[PDB]
């Protein structure tokens, strides 16, 4: 209720360190308005260790996404018939992506 | 009506005639270029001033030149 969320710290150069405002909690930085602090609290994160572990996970996922992109274009490229399976695509996106995603989040 | 003029620099490419969307130009027999044909503008009254002919003209400078002039129902391309 008193400490202002801050997650960007600037280097002390050409006098720009003034932007590191007194946000509270013995911390100096730029006040953020993305709402991440409240999202992380809602998710139940209570340590910077959990935030660091998710960051590493996201990079592992980013590497996987870039791999998938290279693999599905240079190694195993789906044919047009595959992409034209709209009935199958909707069944998986409604049941898997959306319904499973919502079920997992409820967990 | 807009003033359309053809110049001796014409090479008889017929591109302007093919580009015209109102049939203002045509090819007439000539002896000034190797193609033995030169562009002519016998229906300028139907010209709107799109200048597509000039865009199609490849000579430097243009062999076909359009000078926007008096405005009419045809010149303004009005369907009303």
């Amino acid at each position: 209720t008193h400490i202002k969320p801050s997650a960007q710290v600037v280097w002390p150069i050409v006098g720009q360190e003034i932007l590191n405002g007194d946000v509270g909690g013995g911390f100096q930085g730029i006040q953020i308005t993305s709402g991440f602090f409240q999202l992380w609290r809602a998710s139940g994160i209570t340590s910077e260790l959990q935030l660091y572990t998710t960051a590493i996970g996201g990079l592992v996922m980013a590497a996987a996404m870039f791999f998938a992109g290279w693999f599905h274009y240079h190694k195993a490229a789906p044919k047009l018939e595959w992409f034209q399976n709209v009935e199958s695509m909707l069944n998986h996106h409604l049941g898997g992506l959306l319904g499973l995603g919502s079920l997992a989040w409820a967990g | 009506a807009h003033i359309v003029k053809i110049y001796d620099t014409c090479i008889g490419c017929t591109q302007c005639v093919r580009a015209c969307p109102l049939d203002v130009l045509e090819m007439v027999p000539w002896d000034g270029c190797k193609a033995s044909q030169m562009a002519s503008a016998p229906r300028t009254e139907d010209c709107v001033g799109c200048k597509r002919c000039e865009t199609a003209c490849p000579t430097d400078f243009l062999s076909v030149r359009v000078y926007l002039g008096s405005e009419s129902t045809r010149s303004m391309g009005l369907s009303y």
Partner: protein, 63 residues
């Protein structure tokens, strides 16, 4: 065989030409009596993207 030699470099003299005071290569000269028999090719394209044009013998000079 009137006109400049093929493959020779000539400078344009036509004032309204994009390549005025610029040098191009003589692609071919029409021996037939055409108004502009010298076909010249240029490296730089004009505003229309064209890189060739026909000029009269007087409009061109070895350079």
């Amino acid at each position: 065989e009137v006109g400049p030699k093929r493959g020779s470099l000539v400078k344009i003299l036509r004032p309204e030409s994009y390549w005025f005071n610029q040098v191009g290569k003589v692609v071919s000269v029409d021996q037939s009596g055409v108004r502009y028999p010298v076909v010249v090719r240029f490296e730089n394209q004009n505003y229309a993207g064209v890189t060739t044009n026909n000029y009269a013998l007087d409009e061109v000079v070895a350079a």
